[PDB]
């Protein structure tokens, strides 16, 4: 099994930490959801190829521009996350996160991931966003942002229900293996 490195980036409210926790346990915690994620090395077999995929979170580094880039060396794939319940988190993708990741991780594939997809049809979420003249991110808005930023692809998932989580990390593994 060859070793590859994955780093997840995005705003503090994008759900990145929960996504890594749920994938690494194959479970949404029933008793306690951890505040932080240290690291993990997942054994993944995708399309017949075995990989050890090291996983890293950037949570807590968003306000520290000299500490944060120390997470990027030798990254093989980036997950760039936004939450579907937060159009503000999607607005910070093209001109804050994208130029940083392209600078420190040249030629590394980026997969744009819409998190918390279970909230797209949640009445409480729709009522709260409507007060700021907002609505949950539509799938075409996510795809068009991915296309604009030069992403390898666009994917959606829900850490709460686990739907789409395995598929995101299997595709990240495939992207990490490409020349």
């Amino acid at each position: 099994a060859i070793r590859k490195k994955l780093v997840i980036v995005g705003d503090g409210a994008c759900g990145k930490t929960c996504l890594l926790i749920v994938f690494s346990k194959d479970q949404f915690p029933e008793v306690y959801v951890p505040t932080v994620f240290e690291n993990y090395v997942a054994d993944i077999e995708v399309d017949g190829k075995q990989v050890e995929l090291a996983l890293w979170d950037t949570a807590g580094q968003e306000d520290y521009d000299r500490l944060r880039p120390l997470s990027y060396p030798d990254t093989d794939v980036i997950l760039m996350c936004f939450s579907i319940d937060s159009p503000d988190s999607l607005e910070n993708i093209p001109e804050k996160w994208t130029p940083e990741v392209k600078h420190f991780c040249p030629n590394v594939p980026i997969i744009l991931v819409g998190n918390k997809k279970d909230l797209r049809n949640d009445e409480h979420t729709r009522r709260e966003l409507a007060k700021m003249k907002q609505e949950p991110v539509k799938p075409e808005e996510g795809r068009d942002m991915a296309n604009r930023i030069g992403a390898f692809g666009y994917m959606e998932c829900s850490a709460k229900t686990k739907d789409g989580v395995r598929e995101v990390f299997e595709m990240a593994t495939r992207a990490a293996l490409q020349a």
């Binding site: 008793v31 240290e38 090395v41 090291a54 000299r66 120390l70």
Partner: protein, 245 residues
């Protein structure tokens, strides 16, 4: 880590570590506060374990088995003795607060009600000045340590055999040399997240809410100072490249 502490923090949460008959005696808000304090101490125990892998398994093994050129082991593991002293001392204070809070007759049932004062002490005065000096140095030497490691692994057979030997056990799966370096760099930015969540569940005693608010501000002051004090060192970078920053 030693077995007594590993067993005391084996459970996924404080609510699963204490006896169920003791858990039933507390209100939900206390359980929520204790679960986050337990994650701060459990993750601190693992961080000190990361530093012991760096000092004992890697650094001391390279000195006792390999013939590396002088200055190379310090280049791979900058500041590791100072980082170990800072965090083993902090861990000792957290574990003594837990041990004093145990019920007589129990080695597992406790509640920590006064964490804020311990965090203010850790993140102020001479201990905060040492943390700032040490992390400003370590984080500025992080790129150089990774590059030195990659060069030795690709070119020195005895070095490659040593690394493959000591990292083979399953318990080292997450703790190769480069992984340990980034776990240490990332530790300091986990503290605000943990303290803010403990503070959210610490409103019942106003003196505790005030002390955790003071501690959160001290930790963010330390992180801002470390971040402003970092400039990556590079082997072979010329003075002209430096003064043209």
């Amino acid at each position: 880590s030693m077995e007594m502490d590993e067993k005391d923090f084996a459970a996924d949460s404080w609510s699963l570590a204490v006896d169920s008959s003791f858990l039933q005696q507390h209100k939900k808000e206390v359980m929520k506060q204790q679960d986050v304090i337990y994650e701060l101490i459990q993750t601190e125990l693992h961080h000190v374990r990361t530093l012991k892998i760096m000092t004992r398994l890697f650094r001391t093994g390279m000195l006792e088995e390999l013939h590396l050129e002088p200055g190379v082991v310090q280049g791979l593991f900058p500041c590791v003795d100072e980082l170990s002293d800072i965090h083993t001392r902090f861990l000792s204070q957290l574990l003594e607060r837990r041990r004093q809070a145990l019920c007589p007759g129990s080695t597992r049932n406790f509640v920590i009600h006064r964490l804020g004062d311990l965090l203010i002490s850790q993140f102020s005065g001479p201990s905060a000045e040492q943390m700032c000096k040490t992390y400003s140095e370590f984080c500025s030497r992080h790129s150089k340590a990774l590059k030195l490691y990659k060069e030795l692994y690709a070119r020195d057979k005895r070095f490659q055999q040593f690394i493959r030997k000591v990292t083979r056990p399953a318990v080292l799966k997450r703790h190769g040399v480069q992984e340990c370096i980034l776990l240490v760099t990332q530790r300091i930015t986990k503290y605000p997240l943990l303290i803010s969540r403990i503070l959210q569940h610490s409103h019942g005693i106003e003196e505790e809410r005030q002390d955790l608010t003071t501690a959160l501000g001290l930790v963010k002051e330390l992180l801002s100072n470390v971040d402003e004090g970092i400039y990556q060192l590079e082997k072979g970078a010329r003075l002209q490249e430096i003064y043209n920053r």
